[PDB]
Design a protein around this ligand. Sequence first.
Ligand code: A1BKD
Length: 167
Amino acid sequence: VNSFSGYLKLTDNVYIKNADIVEEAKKVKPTVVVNAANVYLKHGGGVAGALNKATNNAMQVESDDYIATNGPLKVGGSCVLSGHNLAKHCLHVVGPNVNKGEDIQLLKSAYENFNQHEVLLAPLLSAGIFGADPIHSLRVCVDTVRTNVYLAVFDKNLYDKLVSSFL
Ligand SMILES: N#Cc1c[nH]c2ncnc(Sc3c(F)cc(F)cc3F)c12
């Protein structure tokens, strides 16, 4: 039993809800919140911009030190950093950005990072400003992630479409 509330169950391990991931993280304080990161951990907009703002820029400060030490992530890769006031940990996962020409096949690799954590609160990877089809992102999620994932979908209109078209 966990503290996530109001989710629709899609599969044995994938759950979904119309919610603002920032407000959902602040309420649940999950072990792991997933950020829709880029390789530079520059959290400017989309989910990353919103998560970073909620930490009062502490996520960005931590991230800049991480990059100065380690260099950029790979597309499809991830790193674990602090969750600050939102979660115990933040798993920064880089899905391919379609508006950058990156191979959508890397989306499966990106979701594989979720399997290193038993339970996660997460957005759909590569959705929103990363330009991929959210219906496709949900399909890859369900077909790749084996651990317990609670998906927050900000757009109520998109959420209803994701539910109604789910196979
Ligand atoms: N900005 C911003 C946000 C603030 N809270 C959020 N909670 C969830 N998602 C997003 S952005 C987004 C989207 F619009 C569509 C999609 F398919 C995947 C996404 F990550 C935000």
